[PDB]
Design a protein around this ligand. Structure first.
Ligand SMILES: O=c1[nH]c(=O)c2[nH]c(=O)[nH]c2[nH]1
Ligand SMILES: O=c1[nH]c(=O)c2[nH]c(=O)[nH]c2[nH]1
Ligand SMILES: O=c1[nH]c(=O)c2[nH]c(=O)[nH]c2[nH]1
Ligand SMILES: O=c1[nH]c(=O)c2[nH]c(=O)[nH]c2[nH]1
Ligand code: NA
Ligand code: NA
Ligand code: NA
Ligand code: NA
Lengths: 295, 295, 295, 295
């Protein structure tokens, strides 16, 4: 036997950073969960108990905090690129660094209609994420995403015209609820290294904003023929709006809301046009995925 | 042996309701998780296999949906009171109904700066809850609450002057982070029945709004001497603002953010006044509780 | 306004302890999650920013570790009693200590059919818990419990003879699945203090063993008329077997497994007597509770 | 823009099946969570609202239940292969089926030392899983795994000799706790189709048993130089014991248990050789991965 692949490091490293403006008193906070996994010439740590090649995961943890102290932690695409570059540059025998960052929301509070200088609210579990793969001699591959964006529309979703055979019981519908948890990823063209990433820094926040805007507006406004068709429209527009993106991925559950037939009780009418009370279903759920690239 | 207490019913009943305005096209959604547990002369179902006294929990489930079809589901204090009253009135041998409702957020989307008529976003896992105890001959006892309201302030929290003895290692501080998950409950004076609850319907939404407003503003503005002192100020104000409340309860974790001493690395200064990067601690956590009544 | 109730302390304190036998090499591990909340003359910490009365929760944490170092952590009823007694004895102004302990399973591994001296497996998320309330001048009140014990029986559960009215759709059945998560609590007669608790130490492990044995055997062997009737039989027997228990509480969800009618597909028969494939339902669920005392 | 990849189906489909022996009365239960995602000529459902190419996910759900009714659900490798083969054979335009199965534990109860014929206990959240990828013209690729196997050893783990530089604070140790959650995957050589899978049916349960046995024994007996070195030994042995496996993957967190220095309190000695009470750390955690193939 032989090692075919190996990567190791520290997961679930929680990180907070504050920025304080001396002149204005305005503080700004960032909170993240970081994972760094390293690859390189480390196979003998597995096969020969040779720990000399191990950069201890405890030290990877320390390095995450130190890097956050000495560099901007925003946008996360930049921070991850700086962090991953560090490991491959500092250690000759380490040839890739895999940096995953989950950014947690801390939105500034409005109190009596004015922004407060140092108080924040977690306005949802929606996350902004990056996957930054820094590979020696092969640049920096970045995937950016938003996840946990939970939405519902109460009409203007349809699903009819699907295949019907001996396995089919679902009725066609021209008016249903659609609810999902949006997982949307935009994959950047390869960067040659940290310099190139830095040359594009403003595009990271702007493209996240575009992705979120397009997601929400398309969801709200598309009289949806299916989850498939709606998600494709989102992907199309994001590609049109940022040429440095190569592909857009969506992964969307269809979180079903079932009608409840109550006609058995006093002839109560709660289906079709008269549907007002529904049963949200925890499981099962449709799962719809696609990756959209340029023609 | 003998039954000293008994209650039974259906938990985790998920409920959605939509309201559609024919004239304007504007739809409004509500989503809840409901639990109903009944008490009464049911001890023989436990001791003598006498199921004749059981209102099947499946039927309790049906009744929840039917009640939601035939009545407003907002404010949840009203809906729970209607639902609980039903069981004690319909079944001679049922003498109490315990109704717990968790309301989930579906906030109307703003698209290109205008409210959308049928699309919604879950802007956090913060919940609005009620516990409605309907007891035959003893009226309706309601506890209202908000929970899962997660906040952080990056300065203007202190903790000094606490007891110090041979078990103490914590350093006094005049500037720390404070973060919590707010669980705040306001307990209504007893209502004699459904009529009295109905006479106060507008006060339920208004008092929830007050509780949330007071929580956030006091958290943001109090240069906090401790969690104890800050939460008490919140409770005080809520009691002052709604005379039909008898008590206010807060349950607040102190979700610690620890400084990280990095001076071991190149003499990096990241403590005290120079603290910028912190380690959020998942556990343990302080837990601070109080119930405030009127003097 | 005035403080009507107050308690504060440290939650989610994770604790491991190892015992090593020098003579045999056999090591034994214990792992717990501890919560300690204190009451006493502490109201001025809430109303007057008077932190002098606060035993810092950080110090409560330290004390938990120190107490675990200097005393047995098993049985948890004893450990909690020692810990709670400490706070009320050490601090004149603290008059109650509320100690909650969740014990996590670490079962010794059997390797090639012999017990291993220092390797363990978590053979489920089933917990053994205590709630120890140490109240100055009022002794020690202990509730012991097992929770997260998940079981299923595939036949010999029935449910028929329940009330039927205009809200009822459930069919009577003489053969169904029953699955639950057992939450069982036994409440000890008040102890006057730590000495009395110590006088009964062997009864704590034995009564937990009895409770678990009775639960499992009664679940397996009772041709159940309902959840109500089966749980009562468990409670009865536990009371019969330990006179120092005053009451037994069960809280049992009915985790439904629904038949699936497949006759629409090639006339496939999968109901009643021919039922083989079922749909486990995540929600809703029945919830059945009772407290049983002595006649 | 254009679809570069697409797959869709039903996730979180809960399935129970019972087998009843008429002659002996002995019943046996299986419970799973199933996900099926399909690929094929379905791009027009995304780009042209062409639902005619969609096998509705609701129908995929039905098919899962029907397949479970008409076939053995054990071993899960076989069931998944039957299920995936169905979709690619039944639908000309569907060319791959991705079947993920999580098997939940229902272990027969022993009551008064004899196996009970129809009562079961969930003896942990450890899962047995399969990922079965059925690809038209490319056979059946199966990955089998065990996950959620949580273990601890209280000594005979070491970690010394690792790289030390200006980022390192971790002390070398010759005696520490090691605890992990085992995620172990064995990847089968490609099968040409369902016939070939069937020809190997007994090897699936046997190889899972071997993987679990080797994991536990190696964990218990290896005086571990590191997580890396121990996991490699497990992988080596599994490959040696089943020639139809091509690779073995392990993914192991190092769930840290920290010493607690209590010498500040009455000179209490709880480190090194005197370490008895530790603080389990929820986060961060090491994460160690490798894929082992044959030389
Ligand atoms: O938008 C949908 N897409 C599907 O593929 C599908 N399948 C299904 O059952 N309902 C839906 N809805
Ligand atoms: O506000 C606080 N209250 C306490 O009771 C306490 N105890 C502690 O350790 N830190 C804090 N902070
Ligand atoms: O054992 C049961 N008890 C009930 O109270 C009940 N109600 C119900 O719908 N099914 C069951 N089953
Ligand atoms: O077995 C270990 N491997 C590592 O890579 C590592 N890194 C670390 O900090 N502790 C450990 N332990
Ligand atoms: Na390198
Ligand atoms: Na009544
Ligand atoms: Na005292
Ligand atoms: Na095909």
């Amino acid at each position: 036997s032989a090692v075919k692949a190996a990567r190791y490091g520290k997961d679930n490293v929680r990180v907070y950073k504050v920025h304080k403006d001396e002149k204005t008193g305005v503080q700004t906070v960032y909170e993240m969960t970081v994972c760094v996994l390293l690859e390189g010439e480390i196979e003998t740590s597995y096969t020969k108990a040779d720990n000399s090649v191990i950069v201890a995961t405890d030290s990877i943890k320390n390095t995450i905090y130190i890097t956050a102290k000495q560099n901007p932690v925003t946008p996360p695409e930049l921070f991850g690129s700086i962090l991953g570059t560090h490991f491959i540059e500092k250690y000759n025998h380490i040839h890739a660094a895999h940096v995953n960052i989950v950014c947690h929301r801390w939105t500034r509070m409005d109190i009596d209609g004015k922004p407060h200088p140092h108080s924040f609210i977690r306005d949802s579990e929606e996350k902004r994420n990056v996957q930054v793969d820094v590979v020696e001699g092969k640049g920096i591959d970045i995937k950016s995403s938003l996840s946990g964006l939970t939405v519902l529309k109460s009409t203007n979703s349809q699903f009819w015209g699907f295949l019907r055979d001996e396995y089919t019981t679902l009725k066609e519908t021209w008016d249903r609820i659609l609810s999902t948890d949006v997982d949307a990823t935009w994959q950047w063209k390869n960067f040659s290294g940290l310099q190139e990433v830095r040359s594009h820094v403003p595009k990271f926040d702007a493209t996240w904003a575009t992705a979120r805007e397009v997601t929400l507006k398309t969801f709200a406004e598309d009289n949806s023929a299916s989850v498939q068709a709606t998600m494709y429209k989102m992907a199309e527009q994001i590609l049109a709006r940022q040429q440095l993106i190569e592909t857009v991925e969506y992964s969307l559950p269809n979180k079903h809301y079932f009608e409840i037939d109550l006609s058995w009780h006093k002839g109560l009418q709660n289906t079709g046009k008269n549907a007002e009370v529904f049963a949200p279903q925890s499981d099962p759920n449709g799962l719809i995925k696609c990756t959209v690239g340029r023609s």
